[PDB]
Amino acid sequence: MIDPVVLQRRDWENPGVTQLNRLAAHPPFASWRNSEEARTDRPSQQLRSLNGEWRFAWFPAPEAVPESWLECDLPEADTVVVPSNWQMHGYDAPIYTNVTYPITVNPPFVPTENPTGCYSLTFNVDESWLQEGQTRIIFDGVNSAFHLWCNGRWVGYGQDSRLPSEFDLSAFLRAGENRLAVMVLRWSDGSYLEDQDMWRMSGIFRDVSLLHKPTTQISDFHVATRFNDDFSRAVLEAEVQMCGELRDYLRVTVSLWQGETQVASGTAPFGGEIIDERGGYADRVTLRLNVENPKLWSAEIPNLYRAVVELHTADGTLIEAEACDVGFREVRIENGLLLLNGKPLLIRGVNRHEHHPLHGQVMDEQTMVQDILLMKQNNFNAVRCSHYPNHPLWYTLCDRYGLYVVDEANIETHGMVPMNRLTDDPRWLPAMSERVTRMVQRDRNHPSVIIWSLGNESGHGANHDALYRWIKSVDPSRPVQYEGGGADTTATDIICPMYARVDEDQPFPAVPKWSIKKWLSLPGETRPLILCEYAHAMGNSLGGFAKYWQAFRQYPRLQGGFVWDWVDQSLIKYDENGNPWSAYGGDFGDTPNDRQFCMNGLVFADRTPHPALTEAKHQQQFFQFRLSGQTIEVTSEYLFRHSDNELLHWMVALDGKPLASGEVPLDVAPQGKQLIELPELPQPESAGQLWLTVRVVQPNATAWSEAGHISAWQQWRLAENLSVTLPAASHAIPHLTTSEMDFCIELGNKRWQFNRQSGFLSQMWIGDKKQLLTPLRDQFTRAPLDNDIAVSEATRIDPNAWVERWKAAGHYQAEAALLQCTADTLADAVLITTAHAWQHQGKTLFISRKTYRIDGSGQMAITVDVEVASDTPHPARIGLNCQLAQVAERVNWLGLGPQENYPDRLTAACFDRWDLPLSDMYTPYVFPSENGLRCGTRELNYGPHQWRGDFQFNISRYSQQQLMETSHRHLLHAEEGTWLNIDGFHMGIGGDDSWSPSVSAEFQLSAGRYHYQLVWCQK
Amino acid sequence: PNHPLWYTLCDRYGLYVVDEANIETHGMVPMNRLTDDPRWLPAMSERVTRMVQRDRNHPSVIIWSLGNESGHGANHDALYRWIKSVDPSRPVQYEGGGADTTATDIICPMYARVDEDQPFPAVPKWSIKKWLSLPGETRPLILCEYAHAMGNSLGGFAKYWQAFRQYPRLQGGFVWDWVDQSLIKYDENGNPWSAYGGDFGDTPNDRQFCM
């Protein structure tokens, strides 16, 4: 077995040892030996990728690894791609757990059965690399700890899954063929700081590379940009550090480029200013470059310069060059406001994990770019790196596309009891400090990073305070935030709670979540408030999103938040027929697990939007609208840019029929206003409601959007002319036929049947074709949403959860008892009158009283009046349902759409005539629930049927019962015909969080008495 | 940190104590080379945290010190905040990097003179009366070392005390120092004599500067 010191020391069970022989952290290097190549950011011959086909063998523990593996390839090993997580190749199971550690909590110890990945690579090194200078290896991401060997000799050890580990291999390599051996441990003492709510995987999951640096080398460099009061003048200050022999002829030149133009330059020998009694840094120099009228960086306009750092002899010999993109911007908190370039930010943010449904936690350029384009297209301007430093390319892309970044240390100890057990313990300070300090050393030159975060969900400990102060000391250019221990501790510049509600206090002992409006004004409080997590987007969610944005806009110091979160953490599995399906917690034999709680995204794992995404896009719009008469007032919420790629399209329609349209160019200054006078509108021919819709279209393509991109919209009701004309009097009269079992009504080809034992319409005919597969009955329940269920930890139930209260009240079990069923014959109609009581174990929950009026024109008017017992939990819905025999291709409606919308999530929807394929009327949430509702609907058309009134509906091939009984979307089967759920009223979906009741009072069905009417006819 | 009995004796006899972390990197160039280096933060933190954990219940300890002559690095700032957080009962002081940095609650220079400025670059030793009223300065001033008692010395001692008594915010200081670091050697006849640097074959050495 591999030995002796390595297995003896057990460095992976010691928080005092987080590395051996690891090189110092630093900003991204490429060691260009040509300055023009550095400037253009073209590939460097001194930076080689070792990604591709490696050899891999799996072992149950490090003790099981054979000693021979160190010297030569194992025959039993396989050839696999690197980077990769070994769970994704099927070597063992990924584990989904939220809070509870995937291992027994016994710090610093891990299980003796410790899955061990043995990676190896035979590769070539050219003689030229070994004759001179330094050859290092860089592992961007290894999860969670590893020992490294080169050509059979031990090199070093590393921890922290989310930052690069670098080792000098100069003395280990030979010309020609070389062999790396990497023993990766799944569990280590590092795991105690990696308890993020996500899939627990392992392996070499980020890039591996070889870097060649000269012996005399740039070892570090920091770029700062400071400004005068109006940002018309800047000073770029670049501190550069060298390693190697100090020499008088050595120089650094820092040159600043705007495209092909060099805007500034400075050259100096080494030797910093005196700093104390012993002198200064002889191995450092600081260059100061004056920049007049700098082009400022923001998410709105991501202006970048190129800084080239040249290490050279005085007489002109370049030793090496390094470089970075530079964004001129100031981030500061002043008078309680987070300012960027002097202006208060409004953070339209989202948390984003590094997740791919096929490749797990391995990130690629295409996916990153896809994510960024989708975020910006949906009006996000900010991302939180939940909850670890990201793949290095992410920051480069955020610099270039323009997104504000919160860079977050890889520290989460959520499963500890209490949460701060390790973070208050000075014995864990060393391991914690490296996760903070090495992040700052790596990422401090990226303009996109505007805020540092100390980690996530690790309570508040003294270690947090120490590292807070370390950051403030080494980098005063960026605020520091941290949510743990109450979101407003001494370790944060920003009040940054998770799931604090807008108006409602949640006064938990020790760590209350105050109403965000209340929080700001607590005695002595002065800081800005930006939620690190809010609007939990789990399944059918984002109810109440508009309430946050209204408050964000009204309150200066409420400066936004980061939605939780971007993308469902579902993984692809394959069934017996090789068909892909989306899996969640427990689907890999992983146990214990927290099931679907890993799926909280605005988008599906494949980046298909959830309906909630449009709600986010709309509330995060950068243009605000008001209407007065026929004048539209457009207000810009851009801070820096003019509206130079925007036109306003307007449209007036009468119940879906276009009356007039037109367009006006937008010419709005940042924070400015523009008045748009609409032309005189034509008088409507018919009766009904006029609707004005405006939309902001971007005529030109950008780096992040296509030509014609819609960025903003708004609707208003204009004039309404109420119909005062009586329908044409029909000559025909429907006939009533009575039996003991049934009332049958006939009118031409049309027939209705009411069952006298049940009291419901049991059948209808058009021609002599039956229309119903299941009778039309009241429905007071929905297939529970993730929010209704309100579970965040599989073993924990909130008795106050809506699903728990509905179940215990017997809402799902309640049986309809007939009280009345009579028939009457009027002058031109047959009138059926019914009353029902729903009861559970002697308690009447609901009473439904109806009339059905069928006239000579063939229309059936259903009037429904419902009583709900005041002491039963408010019902999910008050409506009717039936299974129609007809399966049609299209659904046509006049109401809110086109996408799924609910009462507390309908601001993004527009009133119009919508026409979709039936399949679009179902939302494929991975965990199935009530879905696909559209609200404020006045007319619905499906095949031969038309329903009219003022209702909410959903329509699909899946019953509420099936949705309720099915755990995974791939297990759903289309039922015979089409299930129609038509509601007079429907409860909000909530989502302020998904583990407690979160539906606001105004969206609960608490009125006790409810009235609605539907007219059912043939089209 | 001293032998544990020292604090017990200071508690019982009555002496105010500045308990100081075992951190001095005077010989580094510049002096803060290690203390501004995040890789040395772990080793440094233990010298501070384990001192606090040991001595925090002693009433005689009234002030914590982050060490001596190690310039001023970001590691001092972090450890300053660590103490402030874990023990709000005692001020934290530290002289390195100019005696009035963000890592000290007390302006605590060594060998700053009463009336005479010593305007060294980066780390000046202002007149103590002047130091107090520099623009924005509010802290008390207590010299961590003053009146260097080397051989025939302590000239001008009365000047310090006159100033300490006149100025409220001049709250005294700690003389350097208590006892000559001389060692006993024996001559050919076995008679004892007082030895200093260099007398043991030790080289390089700084001779009598230990006394």
Ligand SMILES: *[C@@H]1C[C@@H](O)[C@@H](O)[C@@H](CO)O1
């Ligand atoms: C905040 C922390 C994050 O990692 C998630 O656990 C989220 C709930 O899904 O809460």
Ligand SMILES: [Mg+2]
């Ligand atoms: Mg360890």
Ligand SMILES: [Mg+2]
């Ligand atoms: Mg967590």
Ligand code: NA
């Ligand atoms: Na605001």
Ligand code: NA
């Ligand atoms: Na989650």
Ligand code: NA
């Ligand atoms: Na425009």
Ligand code: NA
């Ligand atoms: Na379900």
Ligand code: NA
């Ligand atoms: Na005094």
Ligand code: NA
């Ligand atoms: Na001395």
